[PDB]
Design a protein around this ligand. Sequence first.
Ligand SMILES: [Mg+2]
Length: 221
Amino acid sequence: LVHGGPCDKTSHPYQAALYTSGHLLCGGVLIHPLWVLTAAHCKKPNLQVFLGKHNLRQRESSQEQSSVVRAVIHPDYDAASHDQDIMLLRLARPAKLSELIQPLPLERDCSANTTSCHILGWGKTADGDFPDTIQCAYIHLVSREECEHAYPGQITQNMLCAGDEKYGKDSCQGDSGGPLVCGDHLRGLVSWGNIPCGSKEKPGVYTNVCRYTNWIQKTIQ
Ligand SMILES: [Mg+2]
């Protein structure tokens, strides 16, 4: 995440870190004791899920690890256009909850008006390096019209744009699958955007979570 700062230690209990081959690959969101929601492009064999993490370079009393027993990629995910970039990961065992490990509810109403939101993750920072401490930044939802104007013919109904016209705070490589949180509910998942990262001109594009309430419910229940 670029142009943000370190998160408060107790502000992201729903954040998951997804690892493969010993390195962080993506973020994710705990939405139920047995399920982590993330981006479909984060699919890899042998994913490892870590909950309760804050600083990747420090063993933390709150961290918990879990293997994935099943990965459900949206049936219509398209890896070129990024359409329907969403995937559910079933954990081997339900997560043990605490102040540092908690699920985040989903925003079910696509018309919700809480436009001030925040993003978080261990993805690339402004200096081009990957941080040990998870980063946080507040950004604002952008109207679909402006989204379409920035990426003509590339934005689908399954995508939501968000950015910061002041400093260009934005998600980046490694933040993929992480949460776009608005009004204490999950509004989106980090999907794609400008490269190099920065949202002043081109906003970040997030999977429009409100569109998947039915699919997620059916998959989990
Ligand atoms: Mg298709």
